[PDB]
């Protein structure tokens, strides 16, 4: 599982940083930015990843905060389930809730 951040989260964290072209809206353009290492990220990038969860309930927030460092595109999720003692249906819930920000990679 690899994490992704779209332009809406970038604009949202820009608004939050403001708290402390232009004529058209082409719907086929998305400024997709992939966070390669969620553990090794800057402040704005961690802000991106934490704003990605702004709206989901408490269980999803806890499951994301405990499994954010494993979304580096190199750790299989089966080993994550085995090691962290989590339910498979919990992983299914976490994947289905964040449908448009999680990249699935399937290889041996």
């Amino acid at each position: 599982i690899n994490i992704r951040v779209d332009k809406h989260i970038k604009m949202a964290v820009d608004e939050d940083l403001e708290k402390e072209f232009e004529y058209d809206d082409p719907e086929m353009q998305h400024d997709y930015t992939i966070i390669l290492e969620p553990e090794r990220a800057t402040a704005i990038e961690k802000r991106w990843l934490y704003r990605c969860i702004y709206g989901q309930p408490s269980d999803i927030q806890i499951l994301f905060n405990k499994l954010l460092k494993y979304f580096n595109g190199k750790v299989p999720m089966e080993l994550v389930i085995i090691k962290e003692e989590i339910s498979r249906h919990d992983l299914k819930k976490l994947l289905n809730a964040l449908d448009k920000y999680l990249i699935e990679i399937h290889h041996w």
């Binding site: 820009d14 232009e22 004529y23 058209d24 809206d25």
Partner: protein
């Protein structure tokens, strides 16, 4: 049909809320034009501003509204430029003697509270006040007031100051007492 006038500035029609005979469209090159239906009925546009709004009207079907008529007073419209400033153009009219020929009298620039504004709209308040609700490019919607800018500061022989506003009707006086 009653009339058919061939023009290329045929886009988003906003009728004037105070005079139904006047409507204003723009075009692909951003050229805004304020029309009168009686001149087309009988055919030049009543006004023509070169490159006032965003271009590319034929290519993009999702265009923000950066031009609005005024629902607080007559002969006025607001244009939003580069997501930062709103130009409140005030028009003047004269009758060649019932079609009122139009020309631009004064333009007032108001800087927005937050940058990157795509579309906006008016908020009518009491005592002829003006406030603007604006939607940013991030989708955040906020409310911004219009400040009371003094239009005339005259002094008397008794050292008395008389202040006239650009928005409301009341006149402010600071007497020497």
């Amino acid at each position: 049909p009653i009339y058919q006038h061939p023009t290329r500035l045929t886009y988003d029609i906003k009728l004037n809320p105070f005079n139904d005979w006047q409507f204003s469209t723009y075009g692909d090159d951003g050229t805004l034009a304020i029309w009168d239906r009686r001149k087309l009925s009988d055919a030049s546009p009543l006004l023509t501003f070169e490159k006032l709004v965003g271009s590319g009207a034929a290519s993009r079907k999702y265009m923000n509204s950066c031009f609005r008529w005024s629902c607080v007073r007559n002969n006025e419209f607001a244009t939003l430029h580069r997501g930062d400033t709103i130009k409140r153009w005030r028009l003047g009219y004269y009758c060649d003697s019932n079609i009122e020929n139009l020309f631009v009298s004064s333009v007032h620039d108001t800087n927005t509270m937050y940058d990157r504004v795509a579309t906006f709209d008016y908020i009518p308040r009491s005592n002829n006040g003006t406030s603007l609700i604006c939607m940013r490019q991030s989708g955040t919607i906020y409310r911004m007031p219009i400040s009371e800018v003094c239009s005339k500061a005259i002094l008397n022989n008794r050292n008395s100051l008389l202040l006239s506003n650009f928005e409301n009707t009341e006149i402010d006086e600071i007497r020497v007492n």
